[model samples]
Structures are given as C-alpha cells and as structure tokens.
Target: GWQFVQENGRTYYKKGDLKETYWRVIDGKYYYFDSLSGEMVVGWQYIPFPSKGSTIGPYPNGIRLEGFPKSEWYYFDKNGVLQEFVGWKTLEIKTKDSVGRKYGEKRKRYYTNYYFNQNHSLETGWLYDQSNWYYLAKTEINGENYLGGERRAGWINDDSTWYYLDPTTGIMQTGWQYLGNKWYYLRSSGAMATGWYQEGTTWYYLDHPNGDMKTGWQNLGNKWYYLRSSGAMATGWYQDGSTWYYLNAGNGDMKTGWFQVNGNWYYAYSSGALAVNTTVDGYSVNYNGEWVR
Candidate 1:
C-alpha cells in the first residue's frame, strides 16, 4: 500500500521502498511531488501547461503539455495538492544574480511584476481580458515560464498571420489600420490582408505575402484598372494620360466596347482607353466617347 513518509522536514509518498514522484491521486484528491527529488511541491510550482481541453487539473500519468505549451507556473495548496484556479494572478519576479561575489542567488532588489491567465485554463495564443484582445505569447524568465501579454505598439506575427495591437490600450485592431505611414487592411478576424480586399462594391489592392495598401493604376489579372491614391478603386469615368476609361461600378473591372451610362453610349478600346471621336458600325462618337447622331 502507498503511504506518506517524512524524511527530515521534507515529505514524500512511499510505496514499499519506491517513492512516488510528480502527480498522485488518492480519494479524488491530487497531490504533486518533485519529479527530481520526490519532495512534495507546495505553493507556486512551474509545470507543463495543458494545451488541450478546458479543464485544468491533474491526471494519473500526468497532463503532458504536448503542443503550444512551452509551460507556466501553477499554484498548489498548503496540502501540496494542485487545484483548478480561474482568473488572473500576479506573481513577483525575482531573478538570480549572475555577477559579483554572490552569483546564482536571488537579487536583493527585484521587480514585482507578472501576470497569468488561467481563466479556465492556462490560456496562450490569444486572450480576451478587460474588454480588449491580447496576444498571450509564451516567454521564459530565469528558467520559469509564462504567457507574457503583448502591449507594445507595433505588429504581431502569430504563426504566419499578422496583427497589430495597440500599446496604449492593448486592443487588437481589426479592419483598416494606418501604421508606418501606410494603410493596411486587416480582415475582420484581425489578420492583415494582402492581395485584393473588397469593401462593399469597391475593390482595393494590397501587397502580396506582406500587407501594405496600394494605390494608382494597377494591372491585375492582365487587366488594367485605376486606383485612387486613397487606395480606393475607381469606377465610372476616369481620364488617364489624356485617354478616358470606364470601370465597372460593381467590381472595378475595366469596361470595354460599348456601354450605356445615364442614357449616353461610350466605347472603350481593348487597351482600356476610351475611344473618343471614333466610329463603330457606321456610328459617330465625340471626344467624350459619346455617340453623336
């Protein structure tokens, strides 16, 4: 039978002569012991964070972190048992000194700052806290680990997707964001959009692979279309280099041949330039590409 034994002032669970280490279960209660020394781990203990499932607790063999959990510190009770803790936790960080006579000892003066979101479970990746979305990125501190929330004003690259989080409020901005002297169109899901982005019936272009809003004349899919400097696609009538062009109001595609607008007929060349003062099928046109008589 497994039983508890005290060696000196330290406690460990012993079964015959074998000592139990890490997690142990008895009567529906969970206890944690050091994997190295087999001593009962009490208070705050840094362990592998469960990456899957909503329940955060102990397992018979142990809840192996497996995926995105590179780990976080969890608290055990005074009875040396792990419990389900929800909400925020603040822990003081004390780093071991690495210089002078007393090396490897804790520094006398240290910054008391740390935050964790065990809110349901040790949440990583993205977290919503205090009305704002935060990117809880995995980080290491003096051999300990936790999810450090990104509060810096800049870009955040998660996996391959990019997002911009405001430093002042730590709010993740979605949709259009004007950053670095350029406007970037972020999707509603907070992913910085590249390539073509459509708003209502307006078409816009952005940088491919990396996102940066583009403007002016853009040749896309072998068809030339005009985009304003505001990065908004052009529609209706547009004159470029002394040649008038018509673009579809529906999709911003350059219109060719004969098209009717407000009871006026206009002809556009295959080159997307308006055919002004030109005749087609015995019809006469003027400088406005409009049919005359």
Candidate 2:
C-alpha cells in the first residue's frame, strides 16, 4: 500500500507517494469490489479477490481507468487539467533530452536539446541539431546548463566540453573544456583543431581546414607532429627532414586507403566507410584520426 496525500489548491506534489492501493478516492465516492459474486459495490469493505471487480473514472486530462487500482499525483492549472496512465511497462517521454541521439561504434557524435539554470532562474533552450560529441561550449559559472529541453537540469555533457566566460569584464580563460585544465592545439582555425578539449579525460585530434592552434592555451612550442620537410600530410605518411616516413594509423583517425594530392586532403567513399589514398604512389594512407568536415 502506497501513501497518498491530496491537497486543495497547491496544484503541485513533491517527493511523496500514495498510502494504500484501495484508499484512493475516485471522484467523491468510496467504491470497492464485492467479496463473493465479484461485482462493484459502494463502501469501504475488503474484497476476497481484486480481479473479480474493477472501477473506472473519467479523470482530468483525458485519463480514463477501467481496472487501475492506484492513484498517482496529478495537477491542473490555468492551461488545463492533468492526467496520467500507469502500467507495468517502461515509460518513454518525448522531451528534449529524449529527442537527440548518438550512433556509431564509439558514439563519436550526438545531437540534443540544452539549457541553463541558476539559483531559481532557469535559462532554458534547445541545443538545436548538434553533432561531434567531443567538443565544449562557453558559459558562465553559477550559471546552469541543460540539454534536451527546459525541464531536465544538472546533467553532464557526454560529448562537448564546458568552459567559463564573462562578457562584462571582457576577460576569458583558455579552452579548458570541463575544468581549469588547458587543452593542446594541433591546428590554427579555432573551429577545427583538437586535443584534450572535450571528453575531459580522453585525447582528441581533428584535422580540418578551419583548425586553429593558438586559441585555447598550453602552446605546443612547435613540436609539430605532422610532416614538415615536404609540407604535405599524407594519411599515414610523415616527413622528417628530407625523408618520407610511414607508421601505423591505429584506431584514432580512420583516414585509410588514400593519398593527399600535393598538400590538399581528399575524401573517397568506398566499401562501407571512407578512405584516403596517397597521390603519386596510389597506396592506402595511414589513418591519423583527423576531423573530416
């Protein structure tokens, strides 16, 4: 038996539960099942079998019941009355948080709604249709952030990172994502480059034209991991001084089976995935996990 509490005009319920299965009041009548013949009776008496007889109600918010025994908390406001139906199944609500989704083997991308809340003030909204999970957005402290819609709060971003900003003072910190820890830069376009930016703990690398290296923080001091001598970056090949080199592409940037023409990168969709091939030599390029735009 679950505890139940009914208020007059509050129109809201909090951390609470109903008292008993049969003590719930439907309309203003106290109805129960008969003991022997299995029929509905109007009284507060115990019945031998609950399945013998059932009750029904035209509750608010288009909610109707044929044999439901328990009563749940509901409310009505200026907009309309509330109604709910409970059953022995998992409920799926189509709110903001439930709308976006991520696919692929490692969930490299995601899309959802987002919002912000602070003190008692809620700054809620949607995240639009966003992708590329390993990124972070900028906001202020003591300010709340949300995803999906305005209702859900205090949720962590599984893809993008978090940062603090203050427009009033014109002061800003490095691109640290979640905490104060800074990130490493591999490119210079602000929107593309990657390294320990999002995902808090995992290292990320992106190879896009709009990549910028000097935006976040922790300058790399020019130890460029890409090819230098020829000024050309092949998928799996690197250049040290005057010699062309090769290494295992691993599982990071999956740019395999193609070559870069001159200094430009190209994408060729084949098999069931994408690949890159070497130009002059026509060999599979080593995939160095670069962000493909």
Candidate 3:
C-alpha cells in the first residue's frame, strides 16, 4: 500500500520504507521514479504514442519551443520528437553554438574586463557582462535586430536594422575613429586607443593608457614619429620616431625621473627608482624615509 502526494502536477509516492517520485499527466502517460536511485522507471508505459498522440517540446539542452504547459521547461528526445520531461540531472540545459558545436567555449563568466578581438564572437546562451546578463534570442537595447547567436562586424541601425560589413575592409562605422591614420574603436567602457596623424619632429610619448594627452593634433617635422613610451598603458599616447604610439608608459615596474613626495620633486636616481639613495655631497634628498635635509 502507498500514499501519494501531488504538487505542481508532480506526484510523489511513499510505500513501505521506499519513496518514489515522478511526473503525472492529466491525460498523458505516468512516468515513475525508481525507489533506490530515484531514476525514471525505464520501460514503464501508461500509454502508446502516435496512435496514442505524441507530445514534444525541447531537447536535452535548453532550446526554446512553443506549445507547452510551462512557458519554459527542459525536454528530451522520446520516441521521435522532443518531450518536456524532467530528470534529476536535467535542470539547466546547454545550447548549440553558432558553428553547430555543442557545449562551446563559455561566454558569460566572472571577468574583471574582457573584449573580443577580430578573432572570435560569442556563442548562443547566457552572456554575463559586468553584473547584468543577456540571454539568447533577446532583443538588444538597440531594439532593431532580433536576437540570434554569435555575431560579427556589421552596421546596426537605430530602428532595429542590421547590415553586414566586410570584416577586412568594412567602412569605419560610428563609434569608430581614425587617429594618426590608425583605426580604433570606442566603447563606453573605455576611450579610443588607435588611429592617428602626426606632423612634427618632436613626438608624443605617454606611459599610461588612461593618462592625459597633451593634445590631439601634433605636428612632427617628419624626423621623429610618435613612439609608444618605454612603458605606458597601450591606450595612452606618445610621439616616437615615425609613428604615433598609444603609449604603454608602464607601471609597478620601473621608472626614471625626480621623486615627487609631499609635493616637491627631489633629484632622484637616473631611473627614478626609490632605493639606496645616493644624494649627499651633490644635493640633499630623502634617503628611503629619513630626510637628509
């Protein structure tokens, strides 16, 4: 003898010292769970399909489908078509990638910062950006293009329109600029870091990506071009031999110049590195911490 409890159309049966749970259909076949491992009772049938009418939904992985009890639910391949069936290990579902690959590279994850080069694009599934996420088939904020899978370089209009562009020679779209003849992309996440034009002999050199730029238009006489500084953030600027470099001035590594402490600059090591001070007979300077005033 057994007593059954039904919740949300799912039935759980308790008989003797064994407990079993499974999904019960109002007019469909009853799926029972095995008492020991809680697996579905295989080969158990309460009805025949096709002649018994077939029920279909999604496959193992999470795919969207219509005509189902719940707005969203996992399904499996039963008989021939997919069915909305639940399993112990079948809650979260995976999707197929753009290239028809299954379980592709992970997209949404915990990342301090990330970007896609001209190399790869995001596959289908959940995309975790910062604290928020974007789901597949969901309309982007732009509102024009219907959501799909991985995307590439293209022109998207305001009214939900999209136009494909040549990846290699695509015309620079909005949000893109050319600095010093090089192309750079701009995002609210960060500023432009490429494309430039030079006009002088004296070049620009910066050591920080986000460091301030002296000016935009600089005239180099042609002898020297903007060269990326010795070490600076790659997004910064610098004038070098014949090219303008987004200075990667550098940081936390080494530097040279006078020391700036409290507000005054003191003669420092040629490398500006703060260590074993050697400014005695020459000039008074702070050695380590004690001031040799």
Give the best candidate by lDDT: 1
The lDDT for every candidate, in the order shown, is 0.66, 0.28, 0.31
lDDT of 1: 0.66
Name the candidate that leads on TM-score: 1
Worst 10 residues of 3 by lDDT: 96-105
- What overall lDDT, based on C-alpha atoms, would model 2 receive against the true structure? 0.28
lDDT by residue for model 1 over 185-252, one digit each (tens)? Answer: 98878899998888886778998877988888788887777889889888877877798888886677
Q: Can you write out model 2's per-residue Cα lDDT over 188-272, one digit (the tens) per residue? A: 2212244423343333442232222222112132322332222222235544344343322432232334435445444433321
Candidate 2 — which residues are off by over 4 angstroms? 1-56, 59-293
lDDT of 3 by residue, 1-293 (tens): 75554444333455665554333232354443432333342211221121111133223363423432321221223221124332112122222221111111222421111122221221233344434332222223223332333222333322232222324333223333444434334433223333232223333332133322333322333322223332112333332443222222332122234444455444433423343355644555554422365
Candidate 1 residue spans exceeding 4 A from truth: 1-20, 23-33, 39-72, 75-121, 138-153, 195-201, 256-265, 278-284, 291-293
Scored against the true structure, residue 254 in model 2 reaches a CA lDDT of 28
Model 1 poorest ten-residue lDDT run:
96-105
Evaluation by TM-score, superior candidate among 1 and 2: 1
lDDT of 3 at 253: 21
